[PDB]
Amino acid sequence: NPSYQQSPRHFVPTGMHSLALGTNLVEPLHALRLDAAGTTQHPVGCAPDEDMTVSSIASRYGLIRRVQWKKDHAKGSLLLQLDADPFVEQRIEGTNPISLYWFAPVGVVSSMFMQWRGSLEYRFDIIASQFHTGRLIVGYVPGLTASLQLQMDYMKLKSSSYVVFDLQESNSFTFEVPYVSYRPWWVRKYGGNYLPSSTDAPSTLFMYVQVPLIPMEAVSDTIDINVYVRGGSSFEVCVPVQPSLGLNWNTDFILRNDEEYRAKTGYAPYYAGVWHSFSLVFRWGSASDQIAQWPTISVPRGELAFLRIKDGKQAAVGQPWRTMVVWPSGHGYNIGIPTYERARQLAQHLYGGGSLTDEKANQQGPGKVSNGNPVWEVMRAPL
């Protein structure tokens, strides 16, 4: 035993490693493996064919638009005016209360990032035989705000960058949309559920009809044009933020309007139980001072309110407790008193100027808790 008498280190504790960092950083853990050098391995048929990579996800065409190009379109008719951002939109005509949406892979991989830059690539597949002859401008106006989105024609389009395509035999072309902005990157269109920081596109992509469609009398008068979007060779995204998109795997959404009434957060499930400082009262736990607290009901001056639950099956069951009188206990919070009319008379006593200690347990029984935090309906009556 040599005695070590030199001065020791002098650190800072922290509770947790970094959640943000993910590249150049040996992250220590507690592996639930049996070997300390063990790492999952990929044999010759379990091999990763796809490198997960933004420039390999964004480099995939996704169908985004179906354009009806008929014979009776004039020499200036608009076919599409979609925006020159990766968030090109195709909405599903469904019956859900929140509308689902189709995105190109460049849009989904660009929705997790704050900023993007670079050229896009639109592939137009003009589905025609070799006997349809047409010609169409696919142009690009740098910097159109929404007020200048109208007052367009193909003649204003020809002053900017544009591409005139001759539909004679080859019936597909890729217009590579330029990236012209004042900004090296460009902030995402939608953002999280947050109405500011919602920036429209740098520029707009148009597609007019330069020379109208001239179909033969044996082929059809109409032609579908498919429009595909790909992140180009120069497309790139940088800052990882909250995705602006959600999956369709669970499209249920809960509107939190304040008109309905419930217990406070963390005080549910609750059951009818006795309490020594107060007769039954709704308790969220078995220890003392664990009464379920309740919000204050906005009762106007000169009236009163008792309660009745919307669903008696979700209520706490001693009879299932469907009526309740919410009133301050004096300990700084509102208790919910289960009642048997009696709730109306108790609201007449309390809101009329009485107290709990004025003269004006056996029903506990099994003590079934409520089904989570059930919604309580506020019944209101004049005093």
Binding site: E50, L100, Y101, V109, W185, V237, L247
Partner: protein, 252 residues
């Protein structure tokens, strides 16, 4: 063909490549594997004790998978506001675009600080996942099988809450498969259910029924990243998305 490219009618000049932000921000964002290793909130739960729990009884369980859990918005009165409002996060938004995965996961379970009790954590690779229903965090009821207790041979770890209330994990790929399924899962084949989650992690407190009252309705949040061996294999396009800022605001 999909990525064919017939006639590139290019009007553009050359744009200077930033290296996916390497030139400006000092870091490249091309590799999406290293963005997947930022920890995302996996689950969020309030500790609800139903029956009298022994020391062995697991407080909660969850199947461990990179697809994200069956998304708990919450009850219609009290919704979990992140999974209500900020739908699905990043890792199942990228794993939504693939079909198979072969790799490990990390967890970093964060415990409440009011509790002091020692916490055990089991990894159970035996467990099959019977459908996307109940592919979620299960507050465990009274014990009927060996699911509900601490078990012996499975790999465990005990976080002392008094030292640090966060246990950080590395859940290995213990499947007999080539790779596991990655979308939502309906369990057609009976052995296919052995190939979705990496296992089934169960977290349990070692407290008796007198210290169990300080545990009740405290939050436990779980995180996850994909842990350096994760290789999503087959490219499958994305499904219909929902745009978040079109979700309705809570009108006063």
């Amino acid at each position: 063909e999909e990525s064919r490219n017939t006639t590139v009618l290019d009007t553009t000049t050359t744009l200077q490549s930033s290296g996916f932000g390497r030139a400006f921000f000092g870091e490249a964002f091309n590799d999406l594997k290293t963005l997947m290793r930022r920890y995302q909130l996996y689950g969020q739960l309030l500790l609800s004790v139903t029956t009298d729990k022994d020391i062995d009884h697991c407080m909660f369980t969850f199947p461990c998978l990179p697809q994200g859990l069956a998304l708990d918005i919450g009850s219609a009165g009290s919704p979990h506001e992140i999974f209500n409002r900020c739908r699905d996060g990043i890792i199942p938004l990228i794993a939504s675009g693939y079909r198979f995965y072969r790799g490990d996961l990390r967890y970093k379970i964060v415990f409440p600080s009011n509790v002091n009790s020692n916490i055990w954590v089991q990894h159970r690779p035996d467990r099959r996942l019977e459908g996307w229903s109940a592919a979620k965090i299960v507050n465990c009821d009274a014990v009927s099988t060996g699911q509900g207790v601490y078990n012996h041979g499975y790999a465990s770890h005990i976080q002392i809450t008094r030292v640090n209330n966060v246990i950080e994990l590395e859940v290995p790929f213990y499947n007999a498969t080539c790779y596991n399924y990655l979308q939502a899962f309906n369990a057609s084949s009976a052995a296919s259910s052995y190939a979705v989650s990496l296992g089934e992690i169960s977290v349990g407190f070692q407290a008796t029924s007198d210290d169990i009252a300080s545990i009740v309705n405290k939050p436990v949040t779980i995180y996850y990243s994909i842990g350096d061996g994760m290789q999503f294999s087959q490219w499958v396009g994305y499904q219909p998305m929902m745009i978040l800022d079109q979700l309705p605001a809570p009108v006063v």
